[PDB]
Symmetry: D2
Amino acid sequence: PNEECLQILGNAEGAKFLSDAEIIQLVNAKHIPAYKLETLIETHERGVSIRRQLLSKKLSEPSSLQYLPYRDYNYSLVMGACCENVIGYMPIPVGVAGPLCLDEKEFQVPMATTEGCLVASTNRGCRAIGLGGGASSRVLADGMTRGPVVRLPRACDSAEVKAWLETSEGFAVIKEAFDSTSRFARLQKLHTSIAGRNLYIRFQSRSGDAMGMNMISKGTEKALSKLHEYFPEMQILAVSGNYCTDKKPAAINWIEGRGKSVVCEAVIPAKVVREVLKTTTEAMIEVNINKNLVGSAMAGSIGGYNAHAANIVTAIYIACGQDAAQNVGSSNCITLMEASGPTNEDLYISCTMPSIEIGTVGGGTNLLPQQACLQMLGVQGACKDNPGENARQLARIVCGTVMAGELSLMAALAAG
Amino acid sequence: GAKFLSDAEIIQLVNAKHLIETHERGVSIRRQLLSKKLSEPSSLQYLPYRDYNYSLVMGACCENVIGYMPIPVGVAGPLCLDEKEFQVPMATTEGCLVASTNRGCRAIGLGGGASSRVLADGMTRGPVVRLPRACDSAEVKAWLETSEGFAVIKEAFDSTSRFARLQKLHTSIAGRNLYIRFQSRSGDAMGMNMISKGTEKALSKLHEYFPEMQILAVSGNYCTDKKPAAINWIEGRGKSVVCEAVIPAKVVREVLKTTTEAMIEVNINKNLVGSAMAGSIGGYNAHAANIVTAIYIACGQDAAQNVGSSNCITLMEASGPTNEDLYISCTMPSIEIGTVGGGTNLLPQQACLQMLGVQGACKDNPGENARQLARIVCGTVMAGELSLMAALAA
Amino acid sequence: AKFLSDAEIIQLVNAIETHERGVSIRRQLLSKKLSEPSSLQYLPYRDYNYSLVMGACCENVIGYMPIPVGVAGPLCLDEKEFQVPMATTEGCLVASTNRGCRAIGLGGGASSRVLADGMTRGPVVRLPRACDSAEVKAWLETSEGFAVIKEAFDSTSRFARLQKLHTSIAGRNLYIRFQSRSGDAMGMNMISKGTEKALSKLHEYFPEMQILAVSGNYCTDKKPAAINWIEGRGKSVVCEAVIPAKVVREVLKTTTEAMIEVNINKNLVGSAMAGSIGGYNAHAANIVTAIYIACGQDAAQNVGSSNCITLMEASGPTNEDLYISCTMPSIEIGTVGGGTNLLPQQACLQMLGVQGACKDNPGENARQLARIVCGTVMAGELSLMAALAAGH
Amino acid sequence: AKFLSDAEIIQLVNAKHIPAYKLETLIHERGVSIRRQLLSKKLSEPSSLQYLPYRDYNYSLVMGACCENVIGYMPIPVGVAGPLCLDEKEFQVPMATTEGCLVASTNRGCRAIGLGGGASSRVLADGMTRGPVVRLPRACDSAEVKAWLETSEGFAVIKEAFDSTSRFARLQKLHTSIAGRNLYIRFQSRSGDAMGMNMISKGTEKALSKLHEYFPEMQILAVSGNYCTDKKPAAINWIEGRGKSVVCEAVIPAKVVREVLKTTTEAMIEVNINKNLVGSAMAGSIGGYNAHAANIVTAIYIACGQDAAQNVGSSNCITLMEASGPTNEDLYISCTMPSIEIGTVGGGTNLLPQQACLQMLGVQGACKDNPGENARQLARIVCGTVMAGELSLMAALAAGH
Ligand SMILES: CC(C)n1c(CC[C@@H](O)C[C@@H](O)CC(=O)O)c(-c2ccc(F)cc2)c(-c2ccc(F)cc2)c1C(=O)Nc1ccccc1
Ligand SMILES: CC(C)n1c(CC[C@@H](O)C[C@@H](O)CC(=O)O)c(-c2ccc(F)cc2)c(-c2ccc(F)cc2)c1C(=O)Nc1ccccc1
Ligand SMILES: CC(C)n1c(CC[C@@H](O)C[C@@H](O)CC(=O)O)c(-c2ccc(F)cc2)c(-c2ccc(F)cc2)c1C(=O)Nc1ccccc1
Ligand SMILES: CC(C)n1c(CC[C@@H](O)C[C@@H](O)CC(=O)O)c(-c2ccc(F)cc2)c(-c2ccc(F)cc2)c1C(=O)Nc1ccccc1
């Protein structure tokens, strides 16, 4: 009825003795507040069921959520960690491009997308590479960043703090405070910029196999606590002052790197360019120069000297539990093509991606389906013997798959 | 046919270099084939695949399919936008993102609501052609800028589809390269394939006037699609949108745990000065990409287009009788979006579109559903900016 | 003053007849305040025509700075020959540019085209709300709205002919980019006059509009900006030439294949790694700056006027000939007004056959000068790139 | 050749008895006169050089050093803006320009700064750069070279080869970027008081010679691969700095903003945010978050014998304005300029008229007891004068009319 239901709710034995309708009655009349539903209802799926039911009555079409699935999904690894106000899950089709012949190994790359032909095209690119003797890649740099903004009374004071951070002694003190927060914390050279009394400080460090935002933030907050002891008039405006730079386009990531900086390359014989890619080396180069270099230049691109790196980065990231919003900066790529061999008929190809933001532990990689795709690549979880090696390998795979994707689309655009 | 054989027998046929009548059994066999090639043969255990509607995916949205990836969906709302309320779905695995955005919606609702406008509408495709000499490409640019030249090109472009309605051309020369940016609305479709078809016919017509022209590529990165580029920021691409709200001083204190004065200081020195020092083009915001990407995954959009669709400048100012109220606006000139085609043909993705009342084509007013979804995106972005900026202020 | 002494006038102030004595007195007054009173010893000031400078080109004038002018030519451009003046203090610059001119000449000369023409100004206005700024953008975009604004703008001057508007919104800010030719003048003052009269007219339709500044940096004038690269500003120009393989080896001391390699990997890839917007060239700014100083241009406008993409590819039957092109979207320039009122810089404009207004075809002298700047830049690219390729 | 006449030498070249442009070796003031006379008859108007000055100017320091094929010189009017009250000092700033009202406006900016207790500046960083592109057979090999250059022992070997070419050559930390088999190497060092291009180029070439021993396969494609970056707009100069990075600031009392600048603190903050931050942002600027730094930079440079072409990057500036004081009524202003490329020795600073302008500011030539102090000081004057210019123009725009 209503009164009886509240007696049963407050009875230490609880909400599981009420029906869905009785609980909703109690919400509509203002006896139980919308937010408290999380702790009161026992099972996670039943919490989702009720939130959906409440939501449906507020929609102009109450049957809207019919085909949004929710049942029998492991919400235990999601509640309090990955999502709030959960009403179900969104299934994204997963496909496989491979084998990807990279650094003398073969990889079957999972790709989550709803764009027709993207996987097939990426697959034909892998085929060209494989018959061409495989690709090779190198991690050139490694370190996630966080770029807080502090304010001092005057610009002369901000300059003083900058000079202090650049002394051997001052940096060593900040480094100890940063490095004390974690096993993996290992602060690299600080990069700083002034704008008046503003001072942007870019902390960079490895972070084992995790993407590292949480870890770099704990090291950063304690590093600024130490800096405040030497400069007590300094104010910390924001733990992020956009100098990182995270999830926005920025030259600083392209130039300094962020996360993993990777280069990949292959040489495709003329015969493979002809039979797999249906074009010539000469035609490919002409398209690459005038589209990926000259065209991006006329559009005023910073870091966007590629055909569709973002397609590959986004499909792999969604499949592999990465933060897909980091496609903004992680897609940064320059794709170069030149003639190779004795008569300039073989295609040399390289992709350079200075800011791959990636990890195999933490965040979405804690969910089991996301982990199935990480296991396909042999990169799931933390590498105990060699910390960071799995995330490094996953970066290489992304760069190699991007190259495969650049090969195929460019050959398609070359013919017509 | 294949139904009279077992799994092991069909697999024997594939291994000897030599069809299946259900989509799901096709998926199963591909998974078994793939699993023998992996170092951990059990790695696919927790990748689900059963009972998914593969009939709308095969031959349309994905190839070599081995299952699906579940992304948790949460709701941020109610979002009070243009005298209406929306419950915004957000597919994400980042803890706190949905809660933070939800808090931004709460501040906006208590402050009277947000208001938005679509400022421009047209998807683009930017091919690169070339002529024997730069003088020749200059002749072609000139011809295209005459009203008679543009009219014959518009006639060719427009004949390919109902919604193909060529707007003003934008051209750029680099030596004998000519980059031509074609632009048009596309109903409620995002419109890539449609504009591509109009482009092919228009260039074919241009060749009749200029036979020495070579079409080097149907995209010469002048569009620009899925790469950062100032041209999308300055000219727009897809929907250009602005949203705004005024948040009373009291609400900023109670819901957001800061003050108007503090919000302004952080916005200016983070989203304007900070982004400036970082050398940003179009990234003058805190985390528009989090909300764009989450809404996109949930609503069947092309998540790769978060690259350009995330472009956003966030501005905060003093407001009201005593300058204690918080004016906020987000401006997003290049939201690339649609409610038909691509991932929006799938049923779960269509559930999230039905939530917002923007699913499929609007018959009475073509494009209105895609326009409305772009406004919701800009409003949900503004909500997400409100809260995170407030969190960073404290 | 005529009956007084240099010293008595100086004591009057502490406690004029001609311009040169006004300069002499200012120099002496200033020399008192310097730690080294004889600093101005070798700063020349005598026998300079100060009448055209006062109240027009410079204030508090203590003299003038001599910048060596050298000549690079002949430059065979559009079947004409040009002796290009270059005011510089950088050694080897004129000499290198000259070698590039010689290379082009032996390849049959350069061809250029003006692709677009219109100086801009980009005010920022504010409305009470973003919805009001959007209403104004929409109004400006209708044919009737644009026509009202065009009539206003065009009424201020005989050369004021308003082209298509370009606008951008940022909340309640609206940025409006006005564009028009301006005869042979660079045209900032003219464009500004037309802009303010047009904004006044816009205010009659939208009284709540606040005009924040007549430049809101949307122009964009004398700062690096992608809008100039993509939409253009002033004159947009392309120049090209084909250098025979024999000329590349003999005059330039390199090969076609080596030139293409250096250009791709320095001017495209290198500039791309450096995060350049509009700087896809070797040293356009050197040539631009030198011509500008010599021809009475606003040298500060070298910021955007130097915007350039230099391309090189194989040409001819053998694929051994060198094709070169420079594309310069935003050359800001004029042959009337400002520093081109002065007689010495007019001498340099007279060398080029472009001094003053073109009466038969207004704007044609400024266009011609922009073609010369782009051609001379291409010559400078040719030579510096050759020298980088051959490597000492 | 002095025993012949003008008309005779010209008759010899026209008749082709003597090679034309190989005559000024046999013949400086008269060498110019003959080049002009020969040149005038090739022109559509043979009297066009009439009013181009050439007599009574020292061409000896100019010939084979600053200019070639010289036909005269171009006078640029020089105004003075001052006193500029900067770091407890007072400067009279030479500004060579032909733009009306520029000197006057900058002057009003100086006047407001002086009446607000003056400005303060700091050099934040210092070092000229050169950014060659080298090529290895493969990206993997280019990666090898980048890892080697990053080891402390690889760096010291390169640092010793770099520092050997000059006493001022002190190589700072190397910055590298890979693009396939391309490696771009940004060499940076102080250069005393010189702007330092030729000096850094010397040390770079020797340094690459050393690197060529450890990796014989390396091709030096070009001594500049645009990674410096010199005389083109580039985010790398904005983010890393180049030449001198400098910051300047002052507080203008409210009353001074009203009486001298004819506006208010509130109006100035508003215009600055929406023009120099938001406006530049909408226009797609990297490094151009200012009103007209280029005007001031260009004018000082021309007057002081700097390379005016380097105004492209030297003008990079962000101008910030903010409420100051107890009632938020005073104006805080600051200009940050990360890439002022400048020098007081070498190039155009060797010419005497240019040296007079340098002497005016007390920075001509080398500072013997503190090397580089004169160029640093000039950099600070540039940034201070830029801030004066921003003050005045922004107030003019804020008021209107
Ligand atoms: C499937 C993808 C990878 N793809 C695209 C879309 C890429 C899109 O998401 C980003 C681009 O917009 C980025 C850019 O280039 O600016 C096109 C495509 C591209 C551009 C265009 F204008 C029209 C179509 C093509 C394609 C290009 C030429 C053909 F003649 C045909 C198709 C393919 C593609 O790779 N198809 C493909 C199928 C089976 C096997 C091999 C190959
Ligand atoms: C959940 C998200 C939206 N969030 C983040 C991550 C945003 C991330 O995806 C983009 C950023 O990297 C973009 C940028 O700013 O550069 C932070 C966060 C940000 C930066 C940082 F260094 C440390 C943490 C915060 C946060 C900020 C201040 C606090 F004091 C605490 C948390 C929140 C956040 O919104 N938390 C939140 C929870 C419940 C309710 C309300 C509010
Ligand atoms: C005279 C000028 C045009 N020049 C320069 C300086 C250009 C300078 O102001 C802009 C550059 O910095 C822009 C850039 O490329 O980044 C160099 C020069 C360039 C770079 C460098 F590291 C060392 C020297 C060269 C040069 C280059 C290679 C040689 F092996 C020798 C000289 C010349 C030049 O063109 N000299 C020259 C003389 C007679 C005839 C032909 C040719
Ligand atoms: C003398 C210069 C420094 N100045 C300019 C031109 C600057 C020009 O080279 C760069 C700009 O284009 C950069 C930019 O803002 O984008 C304007 C000017 C600017 C823009 C415009 F649209 C109309 C005029 C002004 C000015 C501005 C408002 C007034 F109401 C009047 C004039 C002055 C100026 O400083 N005048 C001035 C005179 C005596 C004393 C004090 C002050």
